[PDB]
Symmetry: C3
């Protein structure tokens, strides 16, 4: 089990991940990331070649979504169902009409006795943590108000590593530069990816108008993790207030949503990007990326969304299997 260079004791790493909850991307270590990336690529190739995907029958899940994120929900449902497992949905509900003045602790104590794991999206910070304390069953965070969204990080990374697989090598001469563009203060999808990318030899360009620039403690977290693998320099973290400067010599352009312009991506603004550059976006977009760009071989935002299926399949498989693995 190799991804060109690195062997993976997928047996060993699963024994370690068995019945792991995944709340923060920080819950995934080096070996676990390699296992998720290897297993996601198996599921990508199996699905694309119309082969049997049912690597996890015998499980019943609960998909508790206490805010409407229809894209994220449906992704997990598809992941579960394509694996050949069954799922029980709670949806169109909010925090208060679901926990009809029942304690959270009590609800996850009971619900964990019904199902084999729970996928949980809640705006409440505190609640996902309370569930993780009370649940007798693994929880996988599909997002909360703490901007924790490990699946979105994992799938953002999977996308990036598919076009620039030297990111895993942590080689001082093979460095990847990324430009984060838009509302970096509130685009919590940026903070999480940053946390993860800084574990590798990466150079960040935060492209924002001042008012919505990347928060101080993300930059501290990035700097910590760059310093830990001896990849921090004066040139690790750069800042720009316009594209022409920011999009120069960057392997990845990750566009964010920008609510309340200089940060609209066009085929114009993409002329002076590298030849190999790939454009990411968690979606939904609005005006952030002009439709003309979809024609551009540089755009991958829809393949990114697609990889979400293969990454959530991987993660569910590695965690919930009672192991034969997927291959070729």
């Amino acid at each position: 089990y190799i991804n060109s260079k690195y062997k993976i004791d997928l047996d060993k790493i699963m024994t370690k991940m068995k019945n792991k909850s995944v709340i923060n991307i920080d819950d995934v270590d080096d070996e676990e990331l390699l296992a998720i990336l290897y297993t996601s690529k198996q599921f990508e190739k199996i699905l694309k070649n119309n082969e049997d995907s049912k690597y996890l029958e015998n499980k019943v899940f609960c998909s508790v979504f206490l805010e409407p994120s229809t894209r994220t929900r449906c992704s997990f449902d598809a992941a579960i169902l394509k694996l050949g497992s069954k799922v029980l949905n709670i949806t169109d509900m909010n925090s208060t009409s679901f926990y009809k003045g029942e304690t959270v602790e009590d609800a996850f104590k009971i619900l964990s006795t019904y199902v084999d794991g729970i996928i949980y999206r809640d705006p409440s910070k505190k609640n996902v943590d309370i569930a993780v304390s009370s649940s007798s069953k693994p929880i996988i965070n599909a997002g909360n108000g703490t901007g924790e969204h490990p699946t979105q990080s994992l799938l953002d990374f999977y996308t990036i590593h598919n076009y620039f697989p030297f990111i895993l090598d942590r080689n001082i001469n093979k460095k990847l530069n990324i430009a984060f563009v838009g509302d970096l203060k509130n685009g919590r999808t940026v903070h999480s990816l940053s946390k993860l990318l800084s574990r590798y030899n990466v150079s960040f360009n935060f492209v924002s108008c001042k008012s919505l620039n990347i928060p101080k403690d993300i930059v501290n977290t990035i700097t910590y993790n760059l310093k830990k693998n001896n990849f921090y320099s004066d040139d690790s973290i750069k800042y720009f207030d316009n594209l022409e400067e920011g999009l120069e010599d960057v392997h990845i352009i990750y566009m964010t949503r920008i609510q309340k312009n200089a940060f609209i991506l066009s085929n114009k603004t993409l002329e002076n990007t590298r030849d190999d550059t790939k454009i990411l976006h968690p979606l939904p977009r609005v005006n952030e990326i002009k439709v003309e760009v979809d024609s551009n071989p540089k755009s991958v935002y829809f393949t990114q969304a697609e990889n979400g299926l293969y990454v959530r399949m991987a993660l569910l498989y590695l965690i919930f299997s009672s192991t034969s693995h997927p291959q070729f």
Copy 2:
């Protein structure tokens, strides 16, 4: 493979043709495709009635996007998918705007089509279903929109009719089927699409309505065209009535429509029309001995309960056939290949 015993069906050939077809308008189904759907539906009817294995399509995952509440139609498809042994993820209790949370439709179906093998889609917007079909990398099946396009309701209406009067397929100048459409024919869009399909065969229509709610000129023109194409048009093809005793005379099929209060100017106007086209055992004594009564449902006062006892009433068997027809359609479209053996048989 044989339907009626007259018509052979290369269910292999016809599947290779239908594989990954979207079905949006009944006009998307041709002659061979109709025969395939009608044959396959009758297999699934007999298999389910005899408590035999129905899992003819196990490895698929669908999305059931219903952006208006149609619980009968939705549940039918869910059952269809699940009885075939496939799985489904539902989006429901949602509307156009809270589903596409200011996301473009194009973007949403582009992404969702990467997750599932096909999409069942109900939306009032006509614009939208068409946009999904353009953007989706996967077959779409329309479960209904504001243009009154509802191919599954047409297909199941037809399947019901052909079960009592199977000579409709024969297009024989001497074996002609007469149907009465009754009630709000202006707004009963379930009438417009069945008419479009029936006129492809040797059929004689009786539109039974009161001035304000008569069948629209469009349908009449479409019917006339299609009757002229197979040389079955006469001055007695299309007849009109403003009362039942004239209209229900010498008709093989009585298709009753919904008459919603919400379509008058008051509730005077309403009960005058509701009550004048209410079907009773009285109003059914002048119908042929073989006549069958259809209704897409829900009924309300359209058909009096006493009529359910009447061997003439089949509206509930019609609703039931919806299961067998949607199983057929999903099987023919989403199967990965055909083999001689793997087709349903009884």
Copy 3:
């Protein structure tokens, strides 16, 4: 093949009898059927706890019609169906009127019964579950209505009790089980139906309530009838109390109810020091102030195991009713 420790069960015979039974009132379960449900639930408990194959009923499709939110009860059934390896289509977040959008109930169950193999149905309407049972061509299982019928809650309440005190089945005049019902017994409809069932056995009730919210007269009459039928009625069969210290004395089971004001009957480790050694505490949940959190640590508390057994009992019931598989062999046996 099939014992409850001491009682044999012709699970073949009993299934041919239960096949395509609707279960609307706990009265729809008789003696042999209860033994079958108790046996089959304990198989599913052991199979699930040991991570073994639970798919004893593939091939079926159900409809889960929930016309009020009971998310705990709904999710329980969904899990029951899915763990058996069958499939379900859900209708939910709906109410009586927006589901039957001026469609007759009769018409709707007539049609929907042609789509699925059975229907799980929760409706506040008294009238409606009965109307569905008349119209449906397919078994119905009541997940609750305004008449306080909830057979699955009774069955699972009983399964919990029989797991700690299995002598309740023996109907032995010397081995009698005493239970305390505590709180709003007027409106705790979960009390009325369990009482109806327990009184079929050698049981002694302590109804612990204020004035306004005491157990209603016809439950007392129903209990007395069923105790008299098996010669277990005495002046000390049914006792009443105003407070816990008196009521919780010498009782095998404390079943706490919700007491919704819209103080005096709160269970603490303090109020539990004068209970028997072997006492088990039940509650249908959600709790609120009824049971203080400190009690969860107490080996006496089983309200969470009760909720859990809901899964094993609904699996049992669905299996016994919807199986078409004859053979003595194909039943669960561990």
